[PDB]
């Protein structure tokens, strides 16, 4: 599992549960295409996004749909979502953990990169 | 001064200086409108990007230069860079400042809205 | 000003207002002697802590009492406090910045050292 | 388990390993009595500090050595350590995760709180 999303919410003290998460690679043409997509689950933590063999070098975008998480708890929140971009794999395959801590006002991001 | 960006650096304990914003408002088509830009001060801090008049409603991102900032430190991040991307709301406070905390591998960001 | 204190709030997205925040020194027997204390503004900045010449190199306790703010917001919160505990080195620059991003859950808290 | 610990390294984006954690209670004479230690594994966790017979009601102090741990990695940081103060059990047991992410002048926290 080279790529997950592990979301945890700051203001209930919880994992962020039904995070929708959609994946972007830069292509050949500098636009962003669809790579993958999931939601987080019950432990705030999304699994099964991708391959080793699919998850090539590129530049990745994890957009996390925090707007639409907390709209769906009743919270009008400030962001739009949370952007993580990031070159992978550029020096051979590695796993990315992608994590974040949820405010409605709010967010912190870090990763957690291992090599296997 | 309706937006404000203040970038700190947690490696250095300090402002975060020269760093590179650049303010995108999203177009009619989707796409993201160059808005306005500067580099962060001394003090980390990015005043005089719009006026009242200029910055009405509608969704604006907020690309802040993380990768060369690091890099012209000698020290090799993440990220490509960090965006915020939120909406303006007339409605909601007038006064909207993005403040970004930096690390090499993480980054924490929150608005302070204000008046 | 060596010695200053900035509070926000990660749920409002707004300065965190009248918080109450205590500063103590370690003295020679590791016992915490109040040092000085104060309310945040309305900007969540609590100013005038200290002078050049009471400020000598030691470990001081920023306590930020987040309970009572949460609380008065009609919030339940996790921590009983925040505290935040470090060195003041003459050698480093003179002016000390704590700052702290509250959630009821959690916080962040970074340092901004300078001159 | 109902008292864990994880930590992250946001320099190095890693878990952060080998990080001594110290656990106090308050006392009935109000002092920080030693209540139980330990150091985080390989994946940053810390794991075993406590059974669920001992951990009874209290206000309890996680103290996070990060200058231990940043001087360990010949770095000079900001803090002495990190400390997460918080009533435990008021409500029945619960399952606490203290989650930190650390850099030389900065520290995250967050708890994680479940209902077994
Ligand atoms: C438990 C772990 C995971 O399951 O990958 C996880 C998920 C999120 C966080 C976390 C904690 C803080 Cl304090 C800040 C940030 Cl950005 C993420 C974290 F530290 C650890
Ligand atoms: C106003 C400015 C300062 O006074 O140094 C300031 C104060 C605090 C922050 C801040 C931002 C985040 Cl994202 C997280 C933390 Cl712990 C502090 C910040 F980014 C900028």
Do not use: Q
């Amino acid at each position: 599992c080279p790529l997950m999303v592990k979301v945890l919410d700051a203001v209930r003290g919880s994992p962020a549960i039904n995070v929708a998460v959609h994946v972007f690679r830069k292509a050949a043409d500098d636009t962003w295409e669809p790579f993958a997509s999931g939601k987080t689950s019950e432990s705030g933590e999304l699994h099964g996004l991708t391959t080793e063999e699919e998850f090539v070098e590129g530049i990745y975008k994890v957009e996390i749909d925090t707007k639409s998480y907390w709209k769906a708890l009743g919270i009008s929140p400030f962001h739009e979502h949370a952007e993580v971009v990031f070159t992978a794999n550029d020096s051979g395959p590695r796993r990315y953990t992608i994590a974040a801590l949820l405010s409605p006002y709010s967010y912190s991001t870090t990763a957690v990169v291992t090599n296997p």
